[PDB]
Amino acid sequence: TVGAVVVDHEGNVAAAVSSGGLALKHPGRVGQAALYGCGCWAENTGAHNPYSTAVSTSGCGEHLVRTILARECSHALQAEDAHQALLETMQNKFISSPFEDGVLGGVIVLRSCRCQTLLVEFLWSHTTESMCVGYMSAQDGKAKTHISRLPPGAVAGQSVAIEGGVCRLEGSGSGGFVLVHAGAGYHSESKAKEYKHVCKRACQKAIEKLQAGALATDAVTAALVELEDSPFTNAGMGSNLNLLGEIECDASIMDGKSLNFGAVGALSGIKNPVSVANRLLCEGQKGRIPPCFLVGEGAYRWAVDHGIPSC
């Protein structure tokens, strides 16, 4: 699973997620990365929502589904202390949730507010051994990547790691901020450099999109395309094969300003599943309500009919 969250120079947020799902899964099994509220969430500041918030989740277990995790995190991040809010959520759902010996997953989040300046707080958290993240603001111009690990002595699925930072943006240009992740799971010293490199490239693509004036959803899509294309990520190319040796992808994207959503489940034969999810969202804005969630052969046919490259 890979994901990204974006805030543009106006404080509009977006989030996306993409996955190959469980290795050897039964054909047609659709997981959290396709499910509204579970895989990602993005919601601009509103009446009962003082922060514009964007969340993308990772893991395996179904625990991301069972708790409607991304939306849960977004709602918890309305509390004053974001670090404490995220930690409490991870602790209650990935250890003590009523909804198993150990719960494995991860999340990236950001929340912004107007101070014209934008205060962006961004965090990542995981109960897996490790998680690779990258982040970048349009004004720093150098993507930062980092491999987050559980401390020495910790036990995956029984402890929570959480880190983050703060970024202050000028709301006057074509800038913004992006945070990505290339997966949460077992630590691998050997491919650490490759994970960091793809997170670096994914951030640079998202920032370049913002700097050309693109929507937050197009910027978060450009990040996920880069993350998908890495043979090392369980999304797009290199997705885990299912029980029959075939690739079936889940992906979704949400726009914080319009609250619109796009998703695909059990999608085969398309190089970049997030591109189809984004196109479903984009066609939803143009619009009977157009579909937001397509699966299987119907999703493939719709992607091809809309000119999304196949593999």
Add this chain to the structure above:
Amino acid sequence: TVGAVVVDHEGNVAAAVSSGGLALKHPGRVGQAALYGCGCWAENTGAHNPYSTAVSTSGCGEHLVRTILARECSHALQAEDAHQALLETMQNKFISSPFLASEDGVLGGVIVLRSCRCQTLLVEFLWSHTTESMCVGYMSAQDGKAKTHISRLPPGAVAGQSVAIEGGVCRLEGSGSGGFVLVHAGAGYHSESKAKEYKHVCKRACQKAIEKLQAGALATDAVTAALVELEDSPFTNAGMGSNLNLLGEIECDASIMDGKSLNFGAVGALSGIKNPVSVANRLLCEGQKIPPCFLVGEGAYRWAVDHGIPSCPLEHHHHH
């Protein structure tokens, strides 16, 4: 769309929902009846949950997804006043949701029950809808006569902008094999024509659920038996008689949740299976015995056949 909610004599709740989805929909479009939190919800009483609650939805698919309505209703029903909680949710979280602010009119409905022990069980059941009408049926094991009712928006209300809400309370003896069921056969335009037919399938659906309960079956097996009967009606947009998609083909969504285990099963874009809810229930059942909870399309069909759920291969499509 059809749905049912059940509570057994112990306060164990279950909920299920089944739909054919939107007429002429693009192949592979999956709606609220397959989606966790959206189509149905069931949650027994627990630490931060004084009531066992069960919810099933109806109506336009995309409005129910964007608002995650079934789960929202279940959480609102933890408040003291269930009638007030449901009405506020329908008004504030559904009609006036910012998630549907672009839409002219918000169309949908819910059935709910919640129970608590006062050994006797107090069951409160309600239905609410923003559509012109909604057909419900309900029954307790001790009354032994199913009641059916077509709920309508009052004169002066505007469909998609007004809320209708009714319900009642039922006290069960928690010493037998009893319980209570509430079903619905659809929410949408009033049709005097098939009004009697919808009422009749709701009555039979309640009777099947109660008979299951009286035979000692789990709440999930009783709610599934209600939905099987509701699906089988040629007049409901679920199972047999489901709306045809853009290619003239059948693609069904269905899901079920168990309040005791909090486990969930669901199918989307399923073709060639007579009773989609049976596959959702079997997924939930095999999950109790990481097992899948949500299968779609070709894989969902193959899984159903491999588990002995009655199929019609002539209704199944698999394009390449």
